[PDB]
Amino acid sequence: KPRLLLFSPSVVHLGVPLSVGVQLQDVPRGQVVKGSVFLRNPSRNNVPCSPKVDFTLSSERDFALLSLQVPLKDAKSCGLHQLLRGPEVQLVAHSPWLKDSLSRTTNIQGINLLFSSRRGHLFLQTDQPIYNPGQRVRYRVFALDQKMRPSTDTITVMVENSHGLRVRKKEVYMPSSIFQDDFVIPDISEPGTWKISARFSDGLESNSSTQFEVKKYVLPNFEVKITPGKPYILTVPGHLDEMQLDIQARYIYGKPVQGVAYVRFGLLDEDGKKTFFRGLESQTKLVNGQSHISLSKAEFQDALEKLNMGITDLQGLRLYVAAAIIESPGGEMEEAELTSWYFVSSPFSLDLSKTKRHLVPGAPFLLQALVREMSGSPASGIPVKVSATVSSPGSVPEVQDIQQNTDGSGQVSIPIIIPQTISELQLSVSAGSPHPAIARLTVAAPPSGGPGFLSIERPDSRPPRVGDTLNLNLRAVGSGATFSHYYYMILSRGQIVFMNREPKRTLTSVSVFVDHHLAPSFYFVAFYYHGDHPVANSLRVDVQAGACEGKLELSVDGAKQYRNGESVKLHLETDSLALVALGALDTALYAAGSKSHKPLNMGKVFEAMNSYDLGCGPGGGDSALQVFQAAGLAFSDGDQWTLSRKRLSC
Amino acid sequence: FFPENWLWRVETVDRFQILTLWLPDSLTTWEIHGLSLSKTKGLCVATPVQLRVFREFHLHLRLPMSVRRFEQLELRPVLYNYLDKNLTVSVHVSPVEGLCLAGGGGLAQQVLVPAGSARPVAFSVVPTAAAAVSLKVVARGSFEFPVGDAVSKVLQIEKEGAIHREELVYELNPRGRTLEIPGNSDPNMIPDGDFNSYVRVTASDPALSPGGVASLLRLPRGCGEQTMIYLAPTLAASRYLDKTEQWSTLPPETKDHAVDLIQKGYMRIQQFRKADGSYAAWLSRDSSTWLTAFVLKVLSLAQEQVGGSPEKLQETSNWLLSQQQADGSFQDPCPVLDRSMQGGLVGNDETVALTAFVTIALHHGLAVFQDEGAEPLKQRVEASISKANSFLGEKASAGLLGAHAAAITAYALSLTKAPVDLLGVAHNNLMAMAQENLYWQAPALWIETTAYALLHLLLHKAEMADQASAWLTRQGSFQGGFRSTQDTVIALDALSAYWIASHTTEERGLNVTLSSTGRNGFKSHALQLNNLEEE
Numbered sequence A: 001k002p003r004l005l006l007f008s009p010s011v012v013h014l015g016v017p018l019s020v021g022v023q024l025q026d027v028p029r030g031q032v033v034k035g036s037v038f039l040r041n042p043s044r045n046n047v048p049c050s051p052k053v054d055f056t057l058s059s060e061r062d063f064a065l066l067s068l069q070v071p072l073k074d075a076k077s078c079g080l081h082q083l084l085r086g087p088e089v090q091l092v093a094h095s096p097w098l099k100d101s102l103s104r105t106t107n108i109q110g111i112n113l114l115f116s117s118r119r120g121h122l123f124l125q126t127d128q129p130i131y132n133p134g135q136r137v138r139y140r141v142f143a144l145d146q147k148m149r150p151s152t153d154t155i156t157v158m159v160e161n162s163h164g165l166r167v168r169k170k171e172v173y174m175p176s177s178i179f180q181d182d183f184v185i186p187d188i189s190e191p192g193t194w195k196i197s198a199r200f201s202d203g204l205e206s207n208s209s210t211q212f213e214v215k216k217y218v219l220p221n222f223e224v225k226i227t228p229g230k231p232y233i234l235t236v237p238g239h240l241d242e243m244q245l246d247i248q249a250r251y252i253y254g255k256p257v258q259g260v261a262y263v264r265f266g267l268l269d270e271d272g273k274k275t276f277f278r279g280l281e282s283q284t285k286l287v288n289g290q291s292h293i294s295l296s297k298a299e300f301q302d303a304l305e306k307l308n309m310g311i312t313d314l315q316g317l318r319l320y321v322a323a324a325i326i327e328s329p330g331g332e333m334e335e336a337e338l339t340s341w342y343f344v345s346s347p348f349s350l351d352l353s354k355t356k357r358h359l360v361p362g363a364p365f366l367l368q369a370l371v372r373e374m375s376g377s378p379a380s381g382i383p384v385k386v387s388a389t390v391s392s393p394g395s396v397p398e399v400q401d402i403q404q405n406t407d408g409s410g411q412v413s414i415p416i417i418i419p420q421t422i423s424e425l426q427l428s429v430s431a432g433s434p435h436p437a438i439a440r441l442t443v444a445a446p447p448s449g450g451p452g453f454l455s456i457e458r459p460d461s462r463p464p465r466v467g468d469t470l471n472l473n474l475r476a477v478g479s480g481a482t483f484s485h486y487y488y489m490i491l492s493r494g495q496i497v498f499m500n501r502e503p504k505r506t507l508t509s510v511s512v513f514v515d516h517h518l519a520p521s522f523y524f525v526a527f528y529y530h531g532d533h534p535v536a537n538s539l540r541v542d543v544q545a546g547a548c549e550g551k552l553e554l555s556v557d558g559a560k561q562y563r564n565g566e567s568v569k570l571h572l573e574t575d576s577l578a579l580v581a582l583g584a585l586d587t588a589l590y591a592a593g594s595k596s597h598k599p600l601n602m603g604k605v606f607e608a609m610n611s612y613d614l615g616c617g618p619g620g621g622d623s624a625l626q627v628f629q630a631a632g633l634a635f636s637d638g639d640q641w642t643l644s645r646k647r648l649s650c
Numbered sequence B: 001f002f003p004e005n006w007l008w009r010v011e012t013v014d015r016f017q018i019l020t021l022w023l024p025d026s027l028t029t030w031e032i033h034g035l036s037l038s039k040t041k042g043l044c045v046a047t048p049v050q051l052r053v054f055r056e057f058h059l060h061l062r063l064p065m066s067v068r069r070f071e072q073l074e075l076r077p078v079l080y081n082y083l084d085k086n087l088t089v090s091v092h093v094s095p096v097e098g099l100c101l102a103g104g105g106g107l108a109q110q111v112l113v114p115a116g117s118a119r120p121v122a123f124s125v126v127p128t129a130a131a132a133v134s135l136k137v138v139a140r141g142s143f144e145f146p147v148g149d150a151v152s153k154v155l156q157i158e159k160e161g162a163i164h165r166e167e168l169v170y171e172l173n174p175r176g177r178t179l180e181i182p183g184n185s186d187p188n189m190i191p192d193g194d195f196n197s198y199v200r201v202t203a204s205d206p207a208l209s210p211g212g213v214a215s216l217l218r219l220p221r222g223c224g225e226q227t228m229i230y231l232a233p234t235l236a237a238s239r240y241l242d243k244t245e246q247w248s249t250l251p252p253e254t255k256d257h258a259v260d261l262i263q264k265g266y267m268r269i270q271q272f273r274k275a276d277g278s279y280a281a282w283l284s285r286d287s288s289t290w291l292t293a294f295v296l297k298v299l300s301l302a303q304e305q306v307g308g309s310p311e312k313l314q315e316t317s318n319w320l321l322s323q324q325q326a327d328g329s330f331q332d333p334c335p336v337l338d339r340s341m342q343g344g345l346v347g348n349d350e351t352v353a354l355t356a357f358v359t360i361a362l363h364h365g366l367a368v369f370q371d372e373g374a375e376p377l378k379q380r381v382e383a384s385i386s387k388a389n390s391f392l393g394e395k396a397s398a399g400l401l402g403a404h405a406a407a408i409t410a411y412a413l414s415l416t417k418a419p420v421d422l423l424g425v426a427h428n429n430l431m432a433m434a435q436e437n438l439y440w441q442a443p444a445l446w447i448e449t450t451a452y453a454l455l456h457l458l459l460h461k462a463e464m465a466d467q468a469s470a471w472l473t474r475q476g477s478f479q480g481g482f483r484s485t486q487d488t489v490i491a492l493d494a495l496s497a498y499w500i501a502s503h504t505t506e507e508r509g510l511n512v513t514l515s516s517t518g519r520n521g522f523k524s525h526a527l528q529l530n531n532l533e534e535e
Ligand SMILES: *[C@@H]1O[C@H](CO)[C@@H](O)[C@H](O)[C@H]1NC(C)=O
Pocket: A205, A206, A207, A208, A209
């Protein structure tokens, strides 16, 4: 019973080549098939909506990756923009061998997809983060395709106003992929946040935005920051920790400052109302730009009882601290805030996102969690204990317990053995010593009576660096020895980047070479056939941030502490011929009152680079169709097909 | 020179270039950030580098951003001394025109600064310039260590008095188009000053389950009369799915299976063509005009997909014209074998109903006619439909007709562009017949009437089409809906037309123009608002 397999990302993008996978199985090995794939829209009489491309592969080479291009000229000739309810397009596979041999109803098989005009990467940058009315604003753009290369398409630059209003728009085509523009802010606009948005002219929803805020200001001479002794405050009954905070005031050129610092306290609720104290106000003299302030438990209890709130009512209240340091003999002053200081009953945070749902019977279930202190870096060396409770329908629920200590990156990998024919699994994760954080979840077993499942295990249990060779092992579960080969695919950014076949042995170790393509997160889906029913499992694998591939280095003539009016010969290094957009920015602007929006770094580049991912969740599913869809892939075997995604995002 | 950001340039890189820059005259820690875009490799951002510039001995100034003219100013140059020895220097502001110095000239002030400390000197200078005046202060040093500094920051003074904002909220409509804004007339206007005016305009912009209708997709089979009961529902379902774009919900290959089946049906009924293309129930049996009109409409509807021959249907239309009588009416030379697929036709009157159906059929046949050639045929069919419309309008004016007849005549006159008076009287009669989403399990006749009425009202949607379309949808949602044949096809067409009417979007443009006769000349502006808000 041969079948044809159609593989394609659930969402296609206009103007970029589309990766489509076609597979053969249960082939008598003595025949060769030939056929073509293309896009067509049913509502416009099935006009060929994309250029034809064929596979014409045989049984000896049953796998073939096809690079199908989707020009926008066909798309606008296709009437795709003329649809009425959702951008829904049909992908089909035409071949006469499907009708004459398999005696199907037609010589064609397809899938339902959703198209979106969003494509490429557009990066925005502003001259300075903080403005005041009456200056000239500079900015520049970068045009980049899906493959992270400069593009020469046409974009439209739009300048938004404070009230969600448009002030200035321009269109320009970039032969150098970089475009510069000037813009003068009106001298009457009220202090508020603005936005610059740019999008490709041919596209519609490919817009990218940056925010620069304008406010009446004068650049300060020194910044003051308040560093609490501990980022969290334990409010468990019986025991209360001491609250102490250090006031540091430094000149913008690094020298210490002297003066007097004035502090007032208060309380912050969820919405943001302020409720200050009386009599807690401390005035101290700075010494070498450092000052330590602490409050005794007794005075804090006196303040709470005077305000009559109650210690037990600090479940989510935020302690408020304000700084009113005055620099003498200058006389000028500025403020600082410590909004991010909560009252919590536990010192640690628990992450349960990476651990997969939809347990698989007969294979060692894996639990993943990330321990991290509140408002801080991930912490190391914290014991974590779990109480696994198997819900066996035919016996008493067994309780299995096991602990492990933090690796160092905050991650935990504690495999737990699960028996067959279970109803569900409930477990409780506790980390902390003392005052542990409790996070409990339950997962139901897949429905019984189906074919044997597939198990994926990762030996190293660590995120590999770029250039390594991660290894995976596969084993079938249940009486399903009928098959002879394993099929596996690698997904990244909603594109089929690698496809291969592996034979069956007692141990089936599959090696994948991670490269710059598989960054920052690549999926991994593998499947086999239990006669006719497809069965599959998937495993999301993260990739370390790594470094660049263009190798930009920027350096100065060391730290000589140069004086004003001097000259510095800057040194810069690149791996390839490139264009560098240097920007020199004063740090005192960061000290100016703002949300301190971080400048452009590798993190945002990776996030937008991965923003095209389709699949959601750690992976793994009950049926083959569900896990295939959850991995952001469209599936159609001729008997079972994937439903269209309900919306662009999960 | 006190900028906030200066190194704003782009250059090429050949793995090595040594650009020498000049430090701006300030005392901060400047951070340089760069981005590289490579055609081969890609985009990388440099690690931030901090280029801390520092002068061991300096003076710092902070001019307030706003200083009202004629009002007292306090100026506080502060001395910073990180040296190791106590300095006794002099501070004096250079005499500049437009400003009254506290000392009124270059008069020096003596102050000693101990090491690692600061010493401010108060100054009281009231501005007297117009817009902006440059000011520089000098801190001249002693013989013991001749160190000095001079800072020159431009001091800008705002205009006289406070600022005022005027708001004129208004609403715009396609009556009351033109409106006039009165000119500025507030008596507190100061004769000299700025006058900035901005315009702020805001756009202020405000089915059936495909599974059931999919079952109607059936292979053609049977004799010359059992074939239509399988092509008409098939064509109707294909049109409904195509025009409501529900093919995506269905399995992808159904549409190709559908076109294969419709091609097979087109071939199957084509083989029963007579010499005159009347398409009788049997080759030996006499032709029926109702069957021929049904064929005409269904093949004309399907002709947009199947590659048929236009001239082979023009002769069918001509033969149909040969069956018109003197008053424009039509009669069947031979009745159908089964009256089940006539449905609403049977009743007190048939000739009015039959003529309405024929008129619907012919108008669907105008589209398939070639634009080149057959001009006499087009003119004669137009004359025929004009005579038929005249007869049907006379019958409608006679009234006392059935609900099915009234609805189908209303639709026929509406689609044929009948004279306005006849359209009005037919519409009035149909509205009078309308019964109260309750309108008209329902039999075949009632859904016939509702579908035809919905087509008329669509060709005539204001609180009415949706309310009866909901009734038609609820009736069709019943399992195995549209039991008969022609009710199926017209109801599917009705839902398709209603659904396209419901979901349709316009440009929603609100272009406005502003023009005035200033003393400096005449100006005009245009503000597109097709798709946001503009100022
Ligand atoms: C494009 O702009 C719209 C404005 O409503 C915004 O919602 C959307 O997130 C933007 N798209 C991006 C940033 O990709």
